[PDB]
Amino acid sequence: RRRQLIRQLLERDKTPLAILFMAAVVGTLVGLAAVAFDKGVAWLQNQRMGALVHTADNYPLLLTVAFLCSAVLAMFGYFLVRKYAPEAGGSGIPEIEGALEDQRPVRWWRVLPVKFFGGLGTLGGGMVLGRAGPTVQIGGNIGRMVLDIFRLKGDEARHTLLATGAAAGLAAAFNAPLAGILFIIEEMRPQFRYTLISIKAVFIGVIMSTIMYRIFNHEVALIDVGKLSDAPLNTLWLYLILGIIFGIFGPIFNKWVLGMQDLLHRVHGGNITKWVLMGGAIGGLCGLLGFVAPATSGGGFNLIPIATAGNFSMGMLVFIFVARVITTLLCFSSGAPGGIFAPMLALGTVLGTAFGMVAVELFPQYHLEAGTFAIAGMGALLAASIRAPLTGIILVLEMTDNYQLILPMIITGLGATLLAQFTGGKPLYSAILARTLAKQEAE
Amino acid sequence: RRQLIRQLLERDKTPLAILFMAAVVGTLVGLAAVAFDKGVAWLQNQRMGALVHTADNYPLLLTVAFLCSAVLAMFGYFLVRKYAPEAGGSGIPEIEGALEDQRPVRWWRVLPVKFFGGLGTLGGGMVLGRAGPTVQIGGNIGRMVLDIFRLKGDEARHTLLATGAAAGLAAAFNAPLAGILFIIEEMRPQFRYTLISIKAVFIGVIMSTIMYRIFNHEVALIDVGKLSDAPLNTLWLYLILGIIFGIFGPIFNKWVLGMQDLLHRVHGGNITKWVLMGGAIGGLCGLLGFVAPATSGGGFNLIPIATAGNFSMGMLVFIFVARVITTLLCFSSGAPGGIFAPMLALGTVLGTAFGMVAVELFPQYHLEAGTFAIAGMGALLAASIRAPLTGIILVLEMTDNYQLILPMIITGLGATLLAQFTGGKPLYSAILARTLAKQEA
């Protein structure tokens, strides 16, 4: 096989020009799509606030239109999914991961409108879910749809345009081009066998998608955290410890998200009406919590900078964490359309901050800032639950821009995946695809 | 499918032994890399102390500048031709070979040969990088602990070989991410599946980078400061720069391949003509290092100067041509030492030059030529080596101008795209191939 190689080596990186051009269009569409999804979710969350001001004096009335506004929008999303596209429940990352294995179908005529409007409801209602998976799935299907429409043939083309769709999808979700590309090559792609996914092509898709996002979202960042202090070498060991803490918690949280899926399934048994009704209840609880304790509901992105800047009491941190584990499991294990990836950012940030707090008072000799531990911990649940640490590290780097924390960030991340492995946890997206692949065969 | 469902549930369970051994490969490669660096530094330094000893007799000082580097050059050419031939050139093609199981890892030979051979060519002030050298050194370190501890299994051989190479590039650049990414973008077997644990490569990279930090803290290889942002309406200029690197990339690849040939005629294969030719090149370098330092040595020094726009357009044109010349002479000659890092200086300079023209052609854009230097730094890496993701992430790690990620990605993609379209090939793949084919003939 020496002679195959010499041939192969000299034929390396020659992606079919058609696949390259089509990547640019998948990128561009996924971009606009993602922008639209974001402005959408924003607007509805905003009307819901304008409605609370309409009734800003009658507290029990305002506690109700806060519930109902989100309850209704929740249901409309649960409904759109149970009725027209069931694969558009949950993240959408397990699903597109499935697709890349050729083990799940890409019914883009159904999921594009279902995910987009269904997500617009759950997210726009202020549920604890991310544009995370949603735009990843949306993007993959966009990729499928141009593959169909232009009738491009070949495995490479199917796998590539599916991959650049998902990567451009995560890029536009976070303004994170590198994190997008990396997610595909670390996690999204078929893990156990070779594939023909052009990286150069994924790159071109990611560029266009990120440029679209920039046309519409320039001048503002999803997280601004400022420039924090450096991390002394003698301070590193504290990050390995935080890594271990995430590493044992990671798997535990994975159990709860899987188990809660089960327990919530009993509430409806499979029935579109019990389900949708259960959805509006969860959704309603969220829109209510969004008024009476906003840090326990919604995306979580708002409280990330507040946590990092150390502006939360230790109590508030403990509160926000427990309350958010609770409402994250309720929202995601329920099957509503929308991911768990992004609410794990807020979860990690909070847990990390808390550790920085204790680290600071235990060692004034180190001149610590709890905010460096928030930043190490931001991608740490991503590392211990999803087991994509390289993506979490690079994502957080793209979002927070504190490169001088790369060593603590890597160390905590590795520490998370290592203790997540060693204590018996599994990659959550892999464990969800598997549950769903083994259910397809179970019946 | 039921295969997948069984596999999915068994995912990311690297054998604890492979994990622990990664930590030790990382730690050794680290110390090794640090030692190689302090070494190269010291010799370059003595050579300067020798020029001060004779600081009045210009034709004498032009001689001990030649000879000091000439001798050290030869000693390196010699150590390679005599004891380990696979330790000529970069060392990346070679470890890439190894990962395909198509080249051998004779660590008992190459560790000392690369390390002291490189110590001579680099420390003599030749135009080569610790680039490949520490990557090869690192892979062999990885091999050597694999042997020593007799770990069995393909995964263990491929992994510990990979973490060695990644920890090696990490330590060479203080670039942990760029290290890991180089393995998954370029170093690993490109055409088939393999069992290289990423988590394990990560652990090796951490330890290696930490070692480098114990000894090199408080200073950065490149400081460039925080440059301006890039307006959306300014992006198209970066796609143009990418195109320019994209057509040049392949041309430069031809020259590095061809010059290998032409320089081989000078010696025919003969250890004495070769080593003697080496000391001549090495001597020319150590001379240029005194009479025009920007045309010789690593190149890292002139990167910040270029980015800050402190070079005339003339000087930029000079430094570029002069450096194409002395890079081909130094690397195509077979001396131990990479082309990866001198391509950084080459791209930076070319980039700056473009920024210069961009600035005066469009004062409406409020440009700073230094943003084009930074987009262009990893652009030869993208158009010649065809590892743009590693180039982009490496430069980001070294220059810390994240607000330039879009221009940097755009120029990079623009490089690989026109490099492909104009018929160039990955230089490390073209060199490994050159060598796997002169082998079965």
Here the tokens at position A384 are 């211990």
Q: Which residues contact A91 (CB under 8 A, 6 or more apart)?
A: A132, A133, A134, A136, A137, A332, A338, A339, A340, A341, A429, A432
Give me the residue label for tokens 């909070």: A350
B89 bridge partner residues: B336
* Nearest CA distance, A337 vs chain B (angstrom): 23
* Nearest CA distance, A362 vs chain B (angstrom): 24
Cα separation, B17 vs A168, whole angstroms: 37
Whether the Cβ atoms of residue B77 and residue B273 lie closer than 8 Å to each other: no
Of A71, A42, A74, residue with least CA distance to A335: A74
Contacts of B209 in chain A (CB under 8 A): 407
First to last CA, chain B: 44
The full DSSP string for A122-188 is HTTTT-S-BSHHHHHHHHHHHHHHHHHHTT--SHHHHHHHHHHHHHHHHHHHHT-HHHHHHHIIIII
Give me the residue label for tokens 């504190």: A402
Whether the Cβ atoms of residue A134 and residue A111 lie closer than 8 Å to each other: no
- The b-or-e profile of A20-38 (16+ CB within 10 A means b, else e) is bebbbbbbbbbbbbbbbbb
Residue numbering of the annotated binding site of B for chloride:
90, 339-340, 428
Whether the Cβ atoms of residue A145 and residue A161 lie closer than 8 Å to each other: no
Say whether B410 and A437 touch across the interface (CB within 8 A): no
Contacts of B2 in chain A (CB under 8 A): 438, 441
Say whether A437 and B214 touch across the interface (CB within 8 A): no
Cα separation, A394 vs A401, whole angstroms: 10
Match domain B1-441 to its CATH number in 3.40.50.300, 2.30.30.170, 1.10.3080.10, 3.50.40.10.
1.10.3080.10
Chosen from A1, A4, A6 to mutate, greatest number of chain B CBs within 10 A: A6
A130 bridge partner residues: A339
Q: What is the CA radius of gyration of chain A?
A: 21
Whether the Cβ atoms of residue A143 and residue A305 lie closer than 8 Å to each other: no
Contacts of A236 in chain B (CB under 8 A): 210
Q: Which residues contact A45 (CB under 8 A, 6 or more apart)?
A: A123, A124, A125, A126, A298
In chain B, the residue whose alpha carbon lies closest to the alpha carbon of A435 is B5
Cα separation, B379 vs B242, whole angstroms: 7
Could you give the C-alpha distances from A117 to A111, A174, B84, B102, B429, in angstroms and in order? Answer: 10, 20, 64, 53, 47
Burial class (CB in 10 A: 0-12, 13-18, 19+), B259: middle
Say whether B202 and A394 touch across the interface (CB within 8 A): no
The full DSSP string for B288-348 is HHHH-GGGSS-STTHHHHHHTT-S-HHHHHHHHHHHHHHHHHHHTTT-B-BSTTHHHHHHH
Angle at A166 between CA A162 and CA A172, to 5 degrees: 140
Whether the Cβ atoms of residue B349 and residue B316 lie closer than 8 Å to each other: yes
In chain B, the residue whose alpha carbon lies closest to the alpha carbon of A13 is B420
Cα separation, B166 vs B188, whole angstroms: 11
Long-range contacts of A320-324 (CB under 8 A, 24+ apart): A320/A295, A320/A296, A320/A350, A321/A347, A321/A350, A321/A351, A321/A354, A323/A293, A323/A295, A323/A296, A324/A128, A324/A295, A324/A296, A324/A300, A324/A350
Whether the Cβ atoms of residue B139 and residue B161 lie closer than 8 Å to each other: yes
Say whether B402 and A403 touch across the interface (CB within 8 A): yes
How determined? X-ray
Cα separation, A145 vs A142, whole angstroms: 5
Give me the residue label for tokens 């690593």: B298
Length of chain A: 443
Q: What residues does each domain of chain B span? A: 1-441
In chain A, the residue whose alpha carbon lies closest to the alpha carbon of B415 is A200
Burial class (CB in 10 A: 0-12, 13-18, 19+), A422: middle
- CATH H superfamily, domain A1-443: Clc chloride channel (1.10.3080.10)
Q: Which residues contact B42 (CB under 8 A, 6 or more apart)?
A: B123
Contacts of A207 in chain B (CB under 8 A): 406, 409-410, 413
Of B28, B29, B9, residue with least CA distance to A436: B9
- The b-or-e profile of B112-137 (16+ CB within 10 A means b, else e) is ebbbbbbbbbbbbbbbbbbbbbbbbb
Contacts of B400 in chain A (CB under 8 A): 403
Give me the residue label for tokens 């156990």: A192
3-state helix, strand, coil in chain A (%, to 5): 75, 0, 25
